[PDB]
Design a protein around this ligand. Structure first.
Ligand code: FMN
Ligand code: FMN
Ligand code: IYR
Ligand code: IYR
Ligand code: IYR
Ligand code: CL
Ligand code: CL
Ligand code: CL
Ligand code: CL
Ligand code: CL
Ligand code: CL
Ligand code: CL
Lengths: 184, 185
């Protein structure tokens, strides 16, 4: 049941040491690749980072940026992050066996929308394969882009650490859908 | 049965029957989408279900006018693709589809647009599971459609999703092999 898959899927920010088989990641990318896209451009590109040194560099640049963000954040965002016990620390960037970086092709019509739609497919596929993920979005994408030698034609959309879930925290609530009809 | 099979089978539907699916089939898809992740768990999607024939007509005509101008002016890669596929500015699915599902994003929420499009991915798979078809329709100017439905300033129209039973839709277009790199470019 698709609803069961979607309902059960939750953020995973803590992963086991063991590396899942690459085939499970590739399966999820093949699922995502079947998604629609503006002018069927398929504007998604994937980079799987496994190198330990590289993961550490990515972790460090992101944590540096997050530190500044956490020092400056306020209001509703600050309150939410505080209540959920978030901090600038992102150990999963080093500890996840894979970092799946998802890029969009700048030139494609509705490229960014299309890649995010495909990320929806991707996350469901990872859940199907029993893997965990978090759509991590650091304050500064450019530093991470440079670390992996991103071509100028591509834009990093999200970093998805992927691994076996390790006693993840509970899914947050979902308010019921409240639809409107015809007009507001 | 794999998710891959569902994703693989799902394709654009621009040809709809007029027969009205039960509301619960559409609502099911929204319920699935609503389970999606979002920035700060804001759940920044809002759904407007348009069924009124006069209103669908207004939306269709405003979109068609915008498309007509677009087709007269578009050049380059998108023009080449539309031309080869013999697309035109006429949008009969905006009349034929029993539902136009207008999907909005809450502007104030962090990563609102990303989150809504992610949820749209869930939504399309759910519609496929229910045997419904759709197309993420993105007219050249959303502002005129927004005004037609009295969109509050807090919300941005992201996509118009005509939804209904497929009426022998055209085949899925090809997919290039997924492009995967390791560590660095
Ligand atoms: C962001 C986005 C915007 C789209 N906008 C339109 C549109 O304005 N008109 C249209 O006919 N199809 C639109 N589509 C549908 C695409 O043309 C379609 O997904 C693509 O041709 C692949 O179709 P397939 O899955 O049937 O192969 C859109 C799709 C996406 C993802
Ligand atoms: C566009 C987007 C960006 C996100 N960015 C982050 C992030 O930067 N850091 C993080 O820990 N989680 C991030 N998340 C995960 C959300 O916090 C998560 O989806 C939300 O809290 C709901 O989680 P749940 O499905 O487990 O209830 C992001 C999610 C989305 C959709
Ligand atoms: N909105 C126009 C053109 C069009 C068509 C398909 C597509 O994937 C994209 I992006 C744009 C039309 O609907 O004809
Ligand atoms: N990137 C920061 C803050 C954060 C956290 C969760 C979230 O859903 C969103 I949008 C932002 C962090 O990872 O802590
Ligand atoms: N990050 C952008 C918002 C944005 C813009 C375009 C787009 O296609 C999508 I998906 C999201 C910003 O905050 O400005
Ligand atoms: Cl998540
Ligand atoms: Cl094509
Ligand atoms: Cl489509
Ligand atoms: Cl919450
Ligand atoms: Cl009508
Ligand atoms: Cl916006
Ligand atoms: Cl069709």
């Amino acid at each position: 049941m698709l609803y069961d898959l979607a309902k059960k899927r939750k953020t995973v920010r803590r992963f086991k040491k063991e590396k899942p088989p690459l085939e499970d990641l590739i399966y999820s990318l093949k699922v995502a690749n079947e998604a629609p896209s503006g002018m069927n451009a398929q504007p998604w590109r994937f980079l799987i980072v496994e190198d330990e040194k590289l993961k550490g560099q990515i972790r460090r640049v992101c944590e540096r940026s997050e530190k500044t963000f956490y020092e400056n954040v306020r209001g509703r965002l600050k309150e939410w992050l505080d209540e959920k016990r978030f901090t600038w620390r992102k150990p999963f960037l080093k500890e996840a066996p894979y970092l799946l970086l998802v890029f969009s092709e700048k030139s494609a019509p509705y490229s960014r929308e299309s890649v995010w739609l495909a990320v929806g497919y991707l996350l469901l596929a990872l859940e199907e394969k029993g893997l965990g993920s978090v759509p991590y979005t650091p304050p500064d994408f450019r530093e991470v882009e440079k670390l992996v030698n991103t071509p100028s034609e591509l834009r990093l959309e999200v970093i998805l650490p992927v691994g076996y879930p390790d006693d993840p925290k509970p899914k947050y609530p979902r308010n019921e859908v409240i639809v409107r009809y015809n007009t507001f």
